[PDB]
Amino acid sequence: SGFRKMAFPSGKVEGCMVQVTCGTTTLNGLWLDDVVYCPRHVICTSEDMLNPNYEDLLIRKSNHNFLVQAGNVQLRVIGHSMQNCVLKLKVDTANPKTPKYKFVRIQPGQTFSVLACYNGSPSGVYQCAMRPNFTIKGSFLNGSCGSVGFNIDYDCVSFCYMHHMELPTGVHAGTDLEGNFYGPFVDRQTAQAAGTDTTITVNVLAWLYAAVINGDRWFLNRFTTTLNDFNLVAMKYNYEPLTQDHVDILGPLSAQTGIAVLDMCASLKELLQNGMNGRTILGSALLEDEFTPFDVVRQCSGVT
Amino acid sequence: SGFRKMAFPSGKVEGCMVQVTCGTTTLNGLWLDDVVYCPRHVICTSEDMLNPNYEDLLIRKSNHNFLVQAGNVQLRVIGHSMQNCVLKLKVDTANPKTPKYKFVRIQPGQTFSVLACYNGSPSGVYQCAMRPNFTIKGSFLNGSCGSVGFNIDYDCVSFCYMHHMELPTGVHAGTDLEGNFYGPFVDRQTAQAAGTDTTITVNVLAWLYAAVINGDRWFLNRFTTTLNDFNLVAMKYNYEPLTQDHVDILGPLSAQTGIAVLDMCASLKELLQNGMNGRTILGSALLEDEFTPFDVVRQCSGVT
Ligand SMILES: *CCS(=O)(=O)N(c1ccc(C(C)(C)C)cc1)[C@@H](C(=O)NC1CCCCC1)c1cccnc1
Ligand SMILES: *CCS(=O)(=O)N(c1ccc(C(C)(C)C)cc1)[C@@H](C(=O)NC1CCCCC1)c1cccnc1
Fold it and tell me: Where is this cross-link: Glycyl lysine isopeptide (Lys-Gly) (interchain with G-Cter in ubiquitin) (chains A, B)?
């Protein structure tokens, strides 16, 4: 019993975080095998941050320009290349602590653990979701860029996020580890605004199923509904359209609670139309949408 | 910028979790040096769980009765002793991964990271607080007992909590690692109820300071107040009395925001008396009290 925002164990990832310094800017890098990954804006000075030419900046630069430290260990740079918005530093030493790892590009609504780091040193771990506008509401201070988001599947670490920047909004944008930004963000000091943030409807339903599983079931109504009828009310409150994919994915939770997906959709409709009236669900006065159906299954099943 | 429920990196602790089996019951144990710590109710059968005599149950038991596994590694038990509600198993092999560790008994309101485990295998990490009634609202399924709560100070792991039981309430009770329960809980299947849970006032103030630091400052009023005047309204809403200790501890946050502790107390009073009116603070429609002043400082400072 109980339901909490739960992050994956960070142990496998802790051993992969290095410090990358290039002149004045210092940030975090990911050391996997004989390659160190970090945001390419490590080569920028506050002069060039307004509209940098990264290809031209990287040309004015050789291996020994870049300083990599793993604690009290200095790594020799054997090569540098730019992959989109990510710098790849080839180093002499393979990381002895390199886990079985994949690079994955996650979809909006999917969740991952962030190991927040400063000077290649892990400070904390928290769970967060890829917002539909391809931002994340994370916790990053200066020097946090190069902090990575990841999932653990079996013994295999899926790296899905590398932190690059804060938008004047105060929310966060980053890349997959192939250096492609999530959303339409560029690595320059320019007027960038995220789109209308919608609510991840399939995640809220997952969270309501978690509430039912943990005895909190006051919001359960005596109605049902249809996808069409529901999606009309979803659009109204800036909720993501609910798909036949999403109903299928909620099947396990539906089966274990004996509450049909459409019945829970009717219960959600009433909450959107009538609010909570000072009531709480799993000790939240708001509807939570940063839990996937898989997050809820894991925590309500007991998956290692 | 940004503010999240952040757990410590779990890496140092991941390497200390073993599986302890004694007959039918299997749970988690903590392997530090040549000692394995686990809840003593591993020696119980559902026969004796109603009113066990643990001294008499432990007497009907020798070293080879207890099965300890570190993955695919079976440890020889050289000794067993009972320390209050904790079993201590002396083993042949010292844990090579044992970190610098302390056992601390934390005070109500203090926070710690929980590494939730099943079969000595870490499943997830989350932050939680010692409630004033000495319970925690955690996330534990069957087989989670022996899961530990900890803080990281410098490179030193402070173990403060070992999970023992769920109360019919659905909240959790456990011990320090010297086997003394937090609160008045006993390790038997009996009608145990936690006391009136109060709100950790000093934590809510810390959280409001975090809100101000992250630009969310609509609730800031044009009044001030006194400890006495405030404590009268605190008692009314089941909030913990605010001490001259607590005001001193909030000093750093007061200094950095330029908001006197008593001004923030006046802002809190209005929220308690008038509610939020459908507004949010750091994206919560409720007042959060599971962040200490030190948690807020760490996350708003950048402490590794
Ligand atoms: C990653 C931390 S940072 O301090 O390096 N940082 C940052 C500065 C400049 C860039 C460029 C891409 C422009 C070279 C990236 C990242 C800041 C940050 O995002 N600053 C922005 C600049 C635009 C206006 C809003 C602030 C940062 C601060 C806190 C957390 N992450 C990043
Ligand atoms: C620790 C998990 S458990 O399944 O072993 N567990 C538990 C059962 C019995 C005990 C005794 C102390 C009575 C021997 C302790 C722990 C349960 C649990 O707490 N069960 C209680 C029994 C009283 C009535 C409410 C349930 C447990 C379940 C989920 C999470 N933690 C513990």
Answer: 5, 90
Helix (H) or strand (E) holding A222: none
Instruction: Provide the chain B residues 170-229 that lie in CB contact (below 8 A) with chain A.
Output: 170-172, 214-215
Q: Is A38 a catalytic residue?
A: no
Question: Does the Cβ of A145 fall within 6 Å of ligand 1?
Answer: yes
| Angle at the Cα of B105 from the Cα atoms of B143 and B59, rounded to 5 degrees | 55
A53 membership: H or E segment, kind and range: none
Fold of the A201-300 domain: main proteinase (3clpro) structure, domain 3 (1.10.1840)
Please name the method used to determine this structure.
X-ray
A11-91 classified as CATH 2.40.10.10: yes
Kindly state the DSSP code that residue A41 receives in the 8-state scheme.
G
- Which two tokens mark B101? 């560790």
